[PDB]
Amino acid sequence: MQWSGARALEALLTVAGELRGPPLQLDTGQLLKIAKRGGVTAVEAVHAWRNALTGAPLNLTPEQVVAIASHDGGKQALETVQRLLPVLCQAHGLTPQQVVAIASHDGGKQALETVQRLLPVLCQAHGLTPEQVVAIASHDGGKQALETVQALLPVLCQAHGLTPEQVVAIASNGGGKQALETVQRLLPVLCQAHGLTPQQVVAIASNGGGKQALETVQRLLPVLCQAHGLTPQQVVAIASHAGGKQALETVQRLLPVLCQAHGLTPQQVVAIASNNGGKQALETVQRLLPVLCQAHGLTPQQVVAIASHDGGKQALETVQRLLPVLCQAHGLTPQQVVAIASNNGGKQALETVQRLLPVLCQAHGLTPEQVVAIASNGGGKQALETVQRLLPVLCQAHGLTPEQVVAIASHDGGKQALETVQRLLPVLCQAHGLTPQQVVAIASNGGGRPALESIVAQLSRPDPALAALTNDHLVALACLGGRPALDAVKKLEHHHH
DNA sequence: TGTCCCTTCGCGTCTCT
DNA sequence: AGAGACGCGAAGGGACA
């Protein structure tokens, strides 16, 4: 390993080799993930207690052991999981998955030990739910956030008017301690001195690095409104993503350069700046906006639409590289390439449309225009890669037409909807009498997976809001508004009927 | 060279309808 | 149905032992 000892790197490669054996049966990716973030002592820990973790009263899966191990301090997390999982599960209600989610962060040990110590008082003195305490705990520095919720949730509720839900939302990010103390320190000035509402201070504080975003809003909002012409509402939208501090500083530096030298509106720079990596997006359009309207290329409108998503930098740089070979050796129009790239993870969708247009048409019989409709949604790579795995079993075994698989894959969260259809098509049809036509219709929207799960939960275990919504009304509800429609129906019955 | 905490970037999914 | 919201992993940086 590192320079200190020697050539018993062999002892470590042997330890890594035995983890490929049983009871964990780890592959290369998994060993690589552990060594890149938990280090050698995490690898050594997994190996030392791979039997204890896999049996005894923990019964962890290898993916579960790999999630706990693959963080700074992983060996402490694995040690502590073995000591605390049972009492957290049995004495406090939490599931194993929830204990693993608390454990799967840097400092995992501290978080688990603190939930043990603080979950009761947080629930009893402050009225939080187990669920909320897990969400506070499940981030790096979760010990600190938990202790800070316990000290400040009273003052933030009383003196500053927030709800617990709100405090929990500021608390449920890495550096949630920092965000929560900054909210206490700056909330009144941000409202009183810059005309913000508590809700906006909250939205700015509710992401990681929220401390930084709030200090930066205090600092640059004046210069950005009073000297660059922006509104308070616009500044807040820039500030309301993690990295907001970077997005605001970059707006200030590039706003006049982009509005004079390249001809964009302020309102368009605001839209590029208002995503995660806004700083990265802005710089990358400031390069690249000359060359992307060259050879003809694209409009400005289309550069802004591609940049206006998380990872905007990545989509532009990828679009700029692959628009030539996509238009020329696969037959796509730029209007199609920009449509692939104008979602979250546009980069990922383009690279998968690269090496799957050929393959999806050949080994599965799809047209190009189908492969484009799949990849023209957020999570393109996931939908395409999962159409490739699951089309065979969905048509042949479960009876579906390919055009039906493609209707389900052609929405954000496609892979979730497909993997749910497969899991839940049998129990929906044969045990509850829904047609495949109806299941496909619920699956064919945003929120296909939750809509299918909620419908099966309502049917399998007749929930409280009962009877009058027959099986066809529930399907009409699941189609119209997904899980939200289904839950609103439940919630409205509970007090009215 | 490990353990803890904090910040930023990017990817994926769901809600709002 | 397009924008705006939710979640969460990877990675990098600083403090301290």
Kindly determine whether the C-beta of residue A347 is less than 7 Å away from any atom of nucleic acid strand B: yes
C1' nearest to CA of A72: which nucleotide?
B3
Burial of A55 (0-12, 13-18, 19+ CB in 10 A): exposed
Experimental method: X-ray
For this entry, resolution in Å reads 2.5
Q: In A 66-125, which Cβ lie closer than 7 Å to strand C?
A: 67, 70, 72, 101, 104-106
Burial of A21 (0-12, 13-18, 19+ CB in 10 A): exposed
If one counts the domains in chain A, the total is: 1
Nearest residue to A56 (alpha-carbon basis) of A25, A78, A76: A78
Kindly determine whether the C-beta of residue A276 is less than 7 Å away from any atom of nucleic acid strand C: yes
Kindly determine whether the C-beta of residue A344 is less than 7 Å away from any atom of nucleic acid strand C: yes
Distance CA A357, CA A364 (A): 11
- Return phi, psi of residue A3, to 5°: -80, 115
Helix A142-157 × helix A108-124 angle, to 10°:
30
* C-beta of residue A56 within 8 angstroms of C-beta of residue A78: no
For A95, the token pair is 């599931």
Closest residue by Cα to the C1' atom of nucleotide C11? A37
C1' nearest to CA of A209: which nucleotide?
B7
Closest residue by Cα to the C1' atom of nucleotide B11? A345
User: What residues are paired with A3 via a beta bridge?
Assistant: A5
Round to a whole number and report the distance in Å from the CA of A481 to the C1' of B17: 8
Burial of A436 (0-12, 13-18, 19+ CB in 10 A): middle
Round to a whole number and report the distance in Å from the CA of A139 to the C1' of B1: 23
Residues 6+ apart with CB under 8 A from A452: A417, A420, A421, A424, A428, A439, A442, A443, A478
Residue whose entry in the numeric block shows the structure tokens 């998380």: A310
Nearest residue to A129 (alpha-carbon basis) of A83, A87, A98: A98
Q: Which range of residues forms the domain containing residue A486?
A: 1-497
Distance CA A65, CA A67 (A): 6
CA atoms within 13 A on the CB side of A13: 6
Task: DSSP letter for A464, please.
Answer: S
For A363, the token pair is 């080994």
Task: DSSP letter for A299, please.
Answer: -
Instruction: Give the DSSP letter string of A420-445.
Output: HHHHHHHHHHTTT---HHHHHHHHSS
Round to a whole number and report the distance in Å from the CA of A112 to the C1' of B9: 27
Kindly determine whether the C-beta of residue A481 is less than 7 Å away from any atom of nucleic acid strand C: no
Closest residue by Cα to the C1' atom of nucleotide B12? A379
Q: What angle do CA A231, A233, A235 make, to 5 degrees?
A: 75
Helix A414-429 × helix A436-443 angle, to 10°:
150
Q: What angle do CA A246, A156, A116 make, to 5 degrees?
A: 90
Greatest C-alpha distance within chain A: 75
Residues 6+ apart with CB under 8 A from A252: A220, A223, A224, A228
Nearest residue to A477 (alpha-carbon basis) of A486, A468, A464: A486
Mapped onto helix, strand or coil, the DSSP state of residue A211 is: helix
C1' nearest to CA of A242: which nucleotide?
B8
Q: In A 221-250, which Cβ lie closer than 7 Å to strand C?
A: 237, 240, 242
Mapped onto helix, strand or coil, the DSSP state of residue A5 is: strand
Nearest residue to A105 (alpha-carbon basis) of A45, A40, A172, A186: A172
Whole-number Cα distances in Å, A355 to A92, A330, A340, A408: 48, 11, 14, 21
